[PDB]
């Protein structure tokens, strides 16, 4: 993955910001709420009735924590993505059938989830940075796809 | 969004189709499997192999929804209202999807109907299953 | 595809925009060409320095007429009728495009309202973004 | 890009008996017709107004010659589209101001003329070798977008 080095100085540099796990658990309850078709993978949840009931639960912060402190330790090999998520790539395709377009519905989430966090400090050109990075690392999920 | 001469051209062309629309059904599943294998996600419990008796099942479903809506193409979503249902509340199939089969459709009659696939009709089957997908997809959310 | 709990979501977080509708309109667009380059292939006509004066006249015409469109929710195709014509026949912005700035919108009302932009209200917003741009995209073809 | 020696067969073989012309013509025709709005680049084309006139077009015929021409150049450096493309990827970005989603709607409706041309010689392995090519160019002018 490209990006300058002003572009990786800025992504670094907010998400050391970051609680992970709290962040996790807020992108993954939205992306359930948001779009309601990604529930279909998590039926073993238990009650994912209302919006208040997901972000809630706590099957669903917990998932959300694994996911993104996988994607968080991704952001230390920006140059190596592909390599990165080789297994988790495969492991998703072959075994947990994971349509990809769910990884980018993620990574608008998550843009969104920022932005709501940081407020100002999530400045136009800091977003464009993140943006590439959420194209880079679903892109990177969906490599060995087959 | 659909003409007076969109529904023309829809119903000559499938009217045309008649009694292979089950096997165009298949055909297109498979062009959508082998060109965009993510579609694949969707259906784990199948044997995609060429051939395969489920997939020609499946493919016979599908052409006969579509029979329905092209019958009553002035009330899709009322026609399709159980298929809206099951594909937004139980199979949840991401909306990107329905594009990717909607160009495989078109492509398999574009080679089954060489003197019928003229650019209007083209045009007007491109509407009609943009239509239909959008019935299907309508109660997502 | 709107309900009514998602038109009572909308009004509430765009009345809480109020003034600064058009200043929220501005950072979008700025959102969007650094973020998706491709839709400068539609602005070649405009200087889009940072804080230049036709952008933000052309996020505040943007924001006023989705206030347009807030204030019409129940009959949308009616109220941005000379806009749908205006994109279709004049401008033919390709459609995807649209999903873009939509999203550009949301993550500058995520950056201007924590209190406001809760989960439910971040669907119905993403809910009513969709509906715009498919009003404004219908007479296409 | 890489393709499969099967794919890379298929590739070629289909294209020995491609008229470039007559193909180039229908697929830039069918596309002004079936996404009208794509004929925003061609206001001194003359008359689009019906599909009729816009099959029958001169200028449309023509360039449709030379866009498709070009295309096929890059059936001969497969290895290297992204190479082969650069310049005329500038061209279309600094110049024509040309939205490269356009490269994938003209992909689409080549595999569909490809397919009413050809019957069922075109079929879906054939189909899946021509989608990866139809990408791989689009994703090669677009590159240089800025
Ligand atoms: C940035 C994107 C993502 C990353 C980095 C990621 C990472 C992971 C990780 C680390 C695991 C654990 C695998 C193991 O146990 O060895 C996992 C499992 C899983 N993920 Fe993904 N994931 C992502 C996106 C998604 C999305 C968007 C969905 C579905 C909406 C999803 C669905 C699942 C499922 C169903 C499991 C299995 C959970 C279980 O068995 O408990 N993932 N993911
Ligand atoms: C023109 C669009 C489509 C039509 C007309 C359509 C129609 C249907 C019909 C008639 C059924 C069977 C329901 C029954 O048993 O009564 C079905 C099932 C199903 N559809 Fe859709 N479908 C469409 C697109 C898609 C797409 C894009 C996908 C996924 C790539 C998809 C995935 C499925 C799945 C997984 C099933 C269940 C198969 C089984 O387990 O038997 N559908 N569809
Ligand atoms: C929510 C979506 C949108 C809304 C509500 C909207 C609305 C508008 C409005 C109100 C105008 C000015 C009309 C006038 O006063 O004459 C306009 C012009 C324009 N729009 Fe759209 N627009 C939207 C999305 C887009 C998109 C996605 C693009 C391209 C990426 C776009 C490109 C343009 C262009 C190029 C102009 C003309 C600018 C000028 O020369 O002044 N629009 N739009
Ligand atoms: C496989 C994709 C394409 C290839 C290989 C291609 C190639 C070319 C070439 C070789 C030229 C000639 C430039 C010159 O005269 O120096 C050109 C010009 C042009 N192309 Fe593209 N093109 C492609 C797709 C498209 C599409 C889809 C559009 C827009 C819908 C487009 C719009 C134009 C325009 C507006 C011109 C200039 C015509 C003029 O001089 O009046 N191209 N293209």
């Given amino acids: ?146 | 969004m659909l003409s007076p001469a969109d529904k023309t051209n829809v119903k000559a062309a499938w009217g045309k189709v008649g009694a292979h629309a089950g096997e165009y059904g298949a055909e297109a599943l498979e062009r959508m499997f082998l060109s965009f294998p993510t579609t694949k996600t969707y259906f784990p419990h199948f044997d995609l192999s060429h051939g395969s008796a489920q997939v020609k099942g499946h493919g016979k479903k599908v052409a006969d929804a579509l029979t329905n809506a092209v019958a009553h193409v002035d009330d899709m979503p009322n026609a399709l209202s159980a298929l809206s249902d099951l594909h937004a509340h139980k199979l949840r199939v991401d909306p990107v999807n329905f594009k990717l089969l909607s160009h495989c459709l078109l492509v398999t009659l574009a080679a089954h109907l060489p003197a019928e696939f003229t650019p209007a009709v083209h045009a007007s089957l491109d509407k009609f299953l943009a239509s239909v997908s959008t019935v299907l997809t309508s109660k997502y959310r």
């Fill in chain 1, 1 to 146: 993955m490209h990006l300058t080095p002003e572009e990786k100085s800025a992504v670094t540099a907010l998400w050391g910001k970051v609680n992970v796990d709290e962040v996790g658990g807020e992108a993954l309850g939205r992306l359930l709420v948001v779009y309601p078709w990604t529930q279909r993978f998590f039926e073993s949840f238990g009650d994912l009735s209302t919006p208040d009931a997901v972000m809630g639960n706590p099957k669903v912060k917990a998932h959300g924590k694994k996911v993104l402190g996988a994607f968080s330790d991704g952001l230390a090999h920006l140059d190596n993505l592909k390599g990165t998520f080789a297994t988790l790539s495969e492991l998703h395709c072959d075994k947990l059938h994971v349509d990809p377009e769910n990884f980018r519905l993620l990574g608008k989430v998550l843009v969104c989830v920022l932005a709501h966090h940081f407020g100002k400090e999530f400045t136009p050109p800091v977003q464009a940075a993140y943006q590439k990075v959420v194209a880079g690392v679903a892109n990177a999920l969906a490599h060995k796809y087959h």
